[PDB]
From Swiss-Prot:
Biological processes annotated in GO: adenosine metabolic process; CMP catabolic process; dCMP catabolic process; dTMP catabolic process; dUMP catabolic process; UMP catabolic process
Tissues in which the protein is found: Isoform 2 is highly expressed in the brain, heart, spleen, kidney and blood. Isoform 2 is expressed (at protein level) in the spleen, skeletal muscle and gastrointestinal epithelia.
An example Gene Ontology molecular-function term: 5'-nucleotidase activity
Keywords: Cytoplasm, Hydrolase, Magnesium, Metal-binding, Nucleotide metabolism, Nucleotide-binding, Phosphoprotein, Transferase
Full protein name: Cytosolic 5'-nucleotidase 3A
Any single Pfam family the record assigns to this protein: UMPH-1
Organism per entry: Mus musculus (Mouse)
Family assignment from sequence similarity: Belongs to the pyrimidine 5'-nucleotidase family.
Active site: 43, 45
Amino acid sequence: AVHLKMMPEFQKSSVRIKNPTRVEEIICGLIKGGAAKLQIITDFDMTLSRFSYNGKRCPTCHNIIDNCKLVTDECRRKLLQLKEQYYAIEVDPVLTVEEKFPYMVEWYTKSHGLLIEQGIPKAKLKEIVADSDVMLKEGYENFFGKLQQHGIPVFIFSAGIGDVLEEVIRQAGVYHSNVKVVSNFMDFDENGVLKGFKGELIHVFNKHDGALKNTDYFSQLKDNSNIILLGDSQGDLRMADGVANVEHILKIGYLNDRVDELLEKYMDSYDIVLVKEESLEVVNSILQKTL
Ligand SMILES: [Pb+2]
C-alpha cells in the first residue's frame, strides 16, 4: 500500500498535491505493474534541467546558443526584444491557447532565424555546451540510472533545440539507449553549418500534434500502459496523447514561475505540483518503490 505521509520526499514544502488519495491510488498501480509496464514521458528545459542554481537563472537549450561566443551582442539584443514582445503574448490571460499558436510559431521562427544568421557549426556544439552554465536537476544520475538499469523507455519531448539537448545529456553521461529525444533538430549544410530546422516546429502549445506523429514509437510500447509524465507547463500535459493504452498515468508538474497566478491551475491539472524545486527526488522516490 502507498502512504505519502511515510515518504519523506513527499513532505518537502515544495510538494503540492490537491488529491493525495488519488495520487496514492495511481502510484499503487505503478508499483503493481513494475518495470514491465512503465514508460516515462518528459519535457526537458526546466523539467530535467534546473530553472535556477546559486543564486542564478540557468539557461534553456536555446539560451545556450543565445549566450555563446558565436553570437553577437546585437543578435542577443534582438533576441531579447523578441522575447519581451512574444512572452507577453504567451502569458496573456485573455487570449485563448489556440489564439496563441500563430504567435508562438512566429517567435520560434524569428529567433531560430537570427541564430541561423550567426553561423553555428555542428563541430562547435560540444565546446559551446561544455562552456555553458547548464545544470541538470539534483538527482539526475539516479533518475536516468535506475531507468536505464531496468530498461524503462524515456521519451524526452522538447520544444528546445535537440542537438543542444543531446549534447547536454551526452556530456552528463546519461544519454542511454532507453532515452529517445524528439525535439527541434538543426539542419546543416555541406560545411556542417546551421541553415534551418528539421521537421515540423514543436513549441509549447502543440505537443499534441508531435505526440500523435510518433506512432511507431508508442505502438512498439503497447504493453507500457503505466506512464509517469513530467512537465513544466500546461502544454506538456498533452505529451502523452500518442499513447496506445493507458492503465495508470501520473502527471508531475514543475511550477517554476508565475507561482501565485498558476498554482491553482497546476494543482487542478497535474497530480503532483513541485513548486520552485530543483531536484528529481519525488520522482526518484516513486521509481524506488516501483522498479
Ligand atoms: Pb515545457
